[PDB]
Amino acid sequence: NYNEKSQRDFRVVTIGYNLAASRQDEFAERIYPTTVI
Amino acid sequence: TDEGPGEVVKALTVNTNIRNSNNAVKRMLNYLAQLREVVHNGYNRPKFGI
């Protein structure tokens, strides 16, 4: 191998993935306020 | 049945253990068969992928 330029090792970055929701989103909570039954 | 399987579960391990030996014998014999084909056809030099 005349030129051992990198080919297999890379800088690996794993990004976040954070999903969230309230029982009802504010838009719908203000229109339909929650009452627990 | 409330009683467990008893001394028959080990037979499952024995079954797999015997199969391991059989796979070694088959692998050996099939490996030799492939070897015979390669050497007969003529690849005397070391090489990748043959």
């Binding site: 993935y17 954070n18 999903l19 969230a20 929701a21 309230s22 029982r23 627990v36 | 049945t1 409330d2």
Partner: protein, 52 residues
């Protein structure tokens, strides 16, 4: 990752059972269920929703 801010969650335990034979005393038994399984009681709460 998942974030649940404010949501009441009811998690069922389920039937924590083994399907194993259970011997019974069949010599003399009786059954006596009540109205609870139907909730039709509490003063017939379907028409008697209002008492005023």
């Amino acid at each position: 990752t998942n974030v649940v801010t404010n949501t009441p969650i009811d998690v069922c335990k389920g039937p924590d059972v083994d399907g194993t034979a259970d011997k019974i005393n069949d010599k003399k038994i009786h059954v006596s269920q009540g109205l609870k399984e139907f909730q039709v009681a509490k003063g017939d709460r379907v028409e008697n929703e209002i008492t005023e």
